[model samples]
Target chain A: HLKFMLDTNICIFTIKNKPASVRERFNLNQGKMCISSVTLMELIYGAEKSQMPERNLAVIEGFVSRIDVLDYDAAAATHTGQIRAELARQGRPVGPFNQMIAGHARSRGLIIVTNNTREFERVGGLRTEDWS
Target chain B: HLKFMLDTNICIFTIKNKPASVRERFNLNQGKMCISSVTLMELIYGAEKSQMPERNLAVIEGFVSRIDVLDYDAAAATHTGQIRAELARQGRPVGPFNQMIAGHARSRGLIIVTNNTREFERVGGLRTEDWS
Candidate 1:
């Protein structure tokens, strides 16, 4: 019964697959699956660049029936600011969206499900898992 | 050939309408329309919180065929950092996402098309429009 924040790539692949592992691992019907605002940005940015934008959007939209998407609240904002400054001060600044996503998970105390764990694991206290 | 951004709210209303004025004012066939990554975030955030999430997403996805979605590029990132620092120095900090979106438009030298004029007009060099 683990709470997971589905990464954007995982969501897109899962949604597009007729028989995806995402459905088996996560309980979309129970509405336990969630996404962060950063994931939303990733999806939109990716979809917009794809050759089949409409189809990509439709597939992503279909996932709405199963998952609970989350927003960046005040707590996430505060934590994000702290993390941003810490990383900058350390001279290891990361991508803005990636930082925000990691900060969201840190603030919310949720495990992020992603294949790109290495990219986010640099941030201390941010937990993640690879669905593949 | 006027380029318009059609803020998230405007896009949502236009897409959801049975006989929307948006359809009458804009030509969806030309492929000249564009949307910011911020608009995408706003729509996804709004849709995720709505009672009819699926329907809301469907309506928003319906516009995918017409509009070109823009990303926050390197120039935008540089400008955003400067603006963020400036606003912080002035003690009048705006929303992080809002600042990024404004920076994107400013970097590209594009005019923002939004009814939320007062919200984004504080930043200089940002041109905008209001659709009523």
Candidate 2:
């Protein structure tokens, strides 16, 4: 019952074949693992920014095709707004992408599997585990 | 001497011709008004999701072509991180897009012109005006 939301960095590591640990962790999660639509957008943006977009695009497409993409729906939006405001009051804001990812994970009660542990940790009630 | 950053909603309103007041406000700040790259991505995403992607894409392109596009650079990222953390701490977070827009605006000392006033107002040192 432990659904995992892979962050953008984790996806990048998978695509670049950078970390064996990431592969291992993802393999362990398998069916319970997923990603947010924001991560998908980031992947597409990264591919387009690459020197070999055409080739990278296909690879990214293939990778994304295998994962369940979570929507940034109204509930997620409301949750993100709440998280953002709370962090602002505490003077401990994370990046927009990370915040969005955290919101998705928190809203769905999924544990965020990301390499950037420190950032996501700032989001209260959000569980995180580093796969790399 | 007031610099302005237009949010995603403002751009959508312009594209749909929904409000003359938005046009008037934008006209008043023509040279000073700008948008973040994040806003650009949101616009593209919105257009692609619309029923008439081709026409909407053209309209978005035309609208964007007229204004200055601000990059979501390192400073903005850092500032956004701070804002996100603070908001999270305060239990009053905004959306990812709004956070990104606010970060860019705050970093560049630009006032955010958005219809979503309450959210951006939560971001410290951020100035917002509703053009809608």
Candidate 3:
């Protein structure tokens, strides 16, 4: 019963059908799958520049339907500011978007699946893992 | 010339015109503004559930034009796997998306601005800040 958030890279592999393991342990069918809208932007941006734009879009569109995407809205932004101010007061500086992503996970109590572990680790009480 | 990643919260603040400074120090006009695809996901998701989804969507769409959104591509996925394996070897249990985000920052030599600084800090050589 693992709730998985697929990082941008994992989605790429999944779409290409070339993941490290032949069977992705966190495939939507295998568990609860979620994606960050930031990842969606990445996909769209990639498709815009990719040689196989159509293929990429089709793949991403399909993937989005199968997974949940967390979007940054008013609530998320408010949460981010509160978190950012507290961290700064504690003498920590962080990039803005990173904080929001972390905040989303924290608010939802979901484990973040990503490769860049160091940055998110700074957010106290947030759990993360590498799924690539 | 600082490269600043706007966390979801900061963006929200900026969009809502409620940020502390009233003037975003890291506006696209000021520095290199980048956002993780994951953050974008959060933004979209937030908008969908908000009382003012249309307003939220417009705000996000506008922000997209002003910031660089990093998407997870094949390169990112491959890098994620490498990072994940390394972390596992070190007995660092991490979530999948978190690792990929960390790897993306590391691979591109970018700083991650996030609220969940505690989670990402585990990746050596990756810098993070909490702008919560």
Candidate 4:
């Protein structure tokens, strides 16, 4: 069973109802799918800042009510720091949150599902897939 | 008994043994002290970057062996984003890691212990105390 960590974009696309493999892939991989706590934060931020906050909040709550939300814990944060150090040392740094998602996925041996694959793809040795 | 989340600076002071209130306060609050996973990452980054990496890492290992390292979990991340959005709305903001620490503490209803109070003090409704 392949565990998949859905990034912010993938979550957005699926929630916004792409009606394609994004939804298909999500449903097919139901038991193996999750979003990081960091992703949860992103979703929360977007919902609360949106023009229709209550509506958006309801949408997020509905989506989250279904999928697993992995807490970005001490172990994940430690791996994230390692990724940052290595990337910066090699001059191949990704965005902070991207690094975090990558680190969390890598730490748990989960493949990342994202449309913005290039950002996470920049992180070496991390497995990623684009559900575009 | 009040729980305290020691910021990186206070952790350093206590681990490096300031030989004064920082150490004394840590002991007095023995069972009530903890460091955020974000702080753990910071310490790891600092140790790995230091001239005496091994020695500093040993110090960290020894220090961490006794203290609670709270995972910067989903609840904390959600709080972090809320803090960020609210602070940005008010034109008052702390650094990313600082915000993470504050958010984690606030989510857990733990007071933030730090020497750098000015930064966290900017976060409204957050409890902070300096052991110095």
Candidate 5:
């Protein structure tokens, strides 16, 4: 099945219940959609830095419960190192979190769903679907 | 026998032939030392941005040729995600490259040999050796 690795911002938008169709599509592809553990870290960090950690933490837990949380495996890390190094050499390195997530998705041949297609597009051989 | 994962700065020092003792110990510990692919990215990025890229790149290749280059495996990524989240939650997150390498080293139970012991020391359960 075709897969989607939701980027941090996509997960953020999904959990916040904004970008109406994002959730529609997120639910539309239930089993095939997932997120990297790297994104999980970002989400957790976001919750910790939020004013209402307790509430946000629960929200994240609830949100993640329904989706597959993919570990950043060996293949993903290798892809990430190469992706970052290539983008960096070209003078267009994306944000670290974004880069890592992109690598994870690319490694598994998954389409990355994100709000910032522009930045994600910078990665060589990565496909991005804008959910914003 | 124990192992060592040489950090980026330690690699940089060795390549530039600075921190004389660093290279001495580096050469002293021949077979048990390696670097994560993440560290390779940083080193490659450094070479690409240098004024003498051609020369610097050759230097990097030569320096790296003598050591083991470890791929960042699944276990390493798991450790990286947790390490990053814990540090971020503590409001003391280290640099992205350093964190990934630390995760790689910690995952493998290797002592991270570096110049900046202070930063690497913050990672819980990670052992560090300063060669500077």
Candidate 6:
């Protein structure tokens, strides 16, 4: 019963090489694995910044087509604000985009799968596991 | 000759209110103020996610029209990878988009104008000034 939200770094790792362990973990949780829209935006940004834009984008499109992109709706947005406020109060705030991803995970009760363990750890109540 | 790159939070602040001091500082530096494409993407994301998309988008359009939008070229992309590697080595990595924004600024020798002071501070030799 463990759902996972893949972070941008995890997405990039999947493309760069065969992230064997990560793939195996994801396969075990198949339908439960998802990505946030922020991760999609980061991927598209990378594609657009690449030398061969169309080729890079096509690869991204193929990868994204298989995953569920969780929306940053009102509930997520509310949680994002709360997370920011709490982190700010503690003087341990992460970046805005990371906050948004953590918010989406928080609202959905999804564990974050990322190599970025430190920053995500600052986010209160966020359960993160690294696969990279 | 001091060029400044506004972050997404600064752009949102400009839209929400007059941002008098930021505007004054920008006026002093006039034509040197700009924004990274990553900032533009974040602004668009916020706009599209807003309840009143049209209204929010219209506001963003007006603000963006007055500033120079810096492209994430090959040099910037190269610097982005380097920055990420350096930060990861130091265990002080920021978000992907922040790294992209910092990369754009670093490549162009521009000071980052952001409310996100801490994360941007992690990138080596990348100067930042808070305007929020």
Over A41-93, each residue of candidate 6 has an lDDT whose tens digit, in order, gives 66766776667767987897788777787655545654665676567668895
Candidate order by DockQ, highest to lowest? Answer: 4, 5, 2, 6, 3, 1
Q: Give residue B108's lDDT in candidate 6 (0 to 100).
A: 89
Write down the TM-score for model 1.
Answer: 0.50
Flag regions of model 2 displaced more than 4 Å: B1-132
Pairs with steric clashes in candidate 5: none
lDDT leaderboard ranking: 4, 5, 2, 6, 1, 3
The runs of at least 3 residues in candidate 5 whose Cα sits more than 4 Å from the true structure, single-residue gaps closed, are: A1-4, A11-20, A23-37, A40-93, A103-110, A122-126, B52-55
Candidate 4 overall Cα lDDT vs. reference?
0.83
Please state every model's RMSD to the true fold in angstroms. 15.2, 13.3, 13.4, 2.1, 4.2, 10.0
Report the lDDT tens digits of candidate 2 across residue range A1-132. 548999988988877767977887777777888887667656654665567767976887688677787655544644565576667667996987777678778989999988889889998999998878
The candidates' interface RMSDs, in order, read 12.9, 12.7, 11.3, 1.4, 4.3, 9.5
lDDT of 6 at B99: 85
Instruction: Name the regions of candidate 1 deviating beyond 4 angstroms.
Output: A18-20, A28-30, B1-100, B103-132
The number of the candidate with the highest DockQ is 4
Superposed by TM-score, candidate 3 places the C-alpha of residue B41 at a distance from the truth, in angstroms, of 14
DockQ of each: 0.03, 0.05, 0.04, 0.64, 0.23, 0.05
Q: How many clashes does the backbone of model 3 have?
A: 82
Poorest 10 consecutive residues of model 2 chain B by lDDT?
Answer: B73-82
Worst 10 residues of 6 chain B by lDDT: B70-79
lDDT of 2 at A72: 59
Q: Which of candidates 1 and 6 reaches a greater lDDT?
A: 6
* Local error of candidate 5 at residue B13 (angstroms): 1.7
Ten-residue stretch with the least lDDT total in model 5 chain B: B72-81
Quote the positional error of residue A33 for candidate 5 in Å: 5.5
